[model samples]
Target: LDSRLPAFRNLSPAARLDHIGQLLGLSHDDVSLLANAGALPMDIANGMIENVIGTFELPYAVASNFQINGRDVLVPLVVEEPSIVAAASYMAKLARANGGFTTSSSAPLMHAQVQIVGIQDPLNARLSLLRRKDEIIELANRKDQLLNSLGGGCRDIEVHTFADTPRGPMLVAHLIVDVRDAMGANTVNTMAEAVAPLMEAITGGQVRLRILSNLADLRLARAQVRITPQQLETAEFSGEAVIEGILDAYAFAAVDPYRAATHNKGIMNGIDPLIVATGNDWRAVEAGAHAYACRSGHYGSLTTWEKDNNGHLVGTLEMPMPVGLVGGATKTHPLAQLSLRILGVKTAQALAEIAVAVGLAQNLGAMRALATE
Candidate 1:
């Protein structure tokens, strides 16, 4: 839809909801869900988590003026902190002059690790697992017939052997499953559990851990935005000066872990809200993102900032975005479903692209403010 909402920030919360309903053509019942309290009923809330005393509330808001890959979309954000939605919206507006944010993502693949220990010959065990890789993959896929039917299942298998460790040698089998549309934790975890016994038998070792990895480096999303100097120009500072300042700020984050921590937190301020709004696991995404940042062996910036030849500011963000449109609270939570409806994303990859785009916008917003203020 036309995500550009003029005077949206000036409107009251009720008015904003009305505008959103009109734009998205939300039905009366759907609109009322947000209008009334307890959108997440106590019954659903209690069922979602254990020992639930009650439900906690946060402001469920939508950011304005987002256009991804030439299509306009309203972003739903649920956050307690101030300025994040505003900053993201403002940056998105600035980006509109330069085609807004462009995004892309890799396939929705997730990893489940099966750890084997107490093997006398870990290297030979690794070779044995590889020789029987197809069998293991078939067994893993058998656990999730529905996923296999949907054309997503175990795609490949990899084995890594540790020849020496304090405890002893070990063998870790990586189940590379293409879990389409789902966050894939439960699916992969179940598949991992299903093949644990078989893995132990093959390797002649005990299966120590059969679990999904939060460091989902295989599934990646990327977003890029460009802003000209004129858009950032202010009464006191030249647009060129602001660009230089942002680059310097980025350089600090790129080199220093202390600066990178806060710098990446700003990016997450934009990402986590949307993740929570969609009822996805923000903690899992957070873990993956931070771990991915250290993939270079040093904690650094997740986003890159530079000045292009055209004398415009450019920013790019790439991270592991293991969010899903299906399963968990994404389907069960009423507001989360509504949030997805607002986004109009059809696939998990699309959702991930939007998240990274918003993260890039938020990082630019923070840097611009820091550079100019």
Candidate 2:
């Protein structure tokens, strides 16, 4: 008999933790720490959240029956709310009745930013910075010869200036980085700081806010699912009716910020946990995501849902995903290494792709349960 049995609600909290660690082959310390109030290492939990005084634990469970690009994937989710893992896993099981979740992604690329302020001649600074672009790139490389040698570092640079602002004129410089297999924060920041003096020289201005931008447009992951109406039919409601209700739910979110905020939280329920488990910056990813959701000056849905001509319920999610497979706790934590190996994601983009896929999975989970409309 499979050992990963015993329903989550049935096991005492401590037993449940031990069962999870053993099934996943985690260290005894990891299992113990997770079970007790003080189990989560302080440093790891602190870095994962904001204003964190002590660690907080959420329900962690696997969303099963996922086959991404024809590969079996065991999805791990961490969340405080009830019904998310159940929803994703239940949908995944339904999806397997056909094939499984089909997923894809773009290459892993992250942005580094340098703000150049106090420029009297704003437009001129833009041109001047471009003229000295090559020198800035070389300087960034020299600052991190080791990273440059590892097939990473500054790939390109861009300059933007704002002449008329509510406060004052400002200029911003951007560094484009090809981080390869890492989340690219520290790496990008190092390069940004390295190029700051060069930017000041070129733009004839003071520099501020040199850092990594977490709005990960250059890196994206996507997942799609098709649920046959026959498979969706239930005692309370027909599958077709449920799909229509979900569409209505999607519409409510698209039109109103009040609803949209809660709607996207479901998506992050799946995203935040993975970031924590892997030791990536969940808060950075969250801030960038919420900001991007409102980039058009109004908050809106981060996902789309519809019925195909075949009458199948289909869903898709595309959002700002900034995660790494090779840095931070993912490299530092004993369990994170095993988690990456278990999932078989070798590059940062692949990991990001999976992150969005899970987000979509979680979205579908929420919609199906909230489908009573």
Q: Which candidate is the best by TM-score?
A: 1
| TM-score against native, each model | 0.98, 0.85
Runs in model 2 deviating more than 4 A are 1-59
TM-score of 1: 0.98
The per-model lDDT (C-alpha) reads 0.95, 0.75
- Candidate 1 global lDDT: 0.95
How does model 2 fare in lDDT?
0.75
Clashes of 1: 0
- In angstroms, how far off is 114's CA in candidate 1? 0.2
- Candidate 2 accuracy as TM-score: 0.85
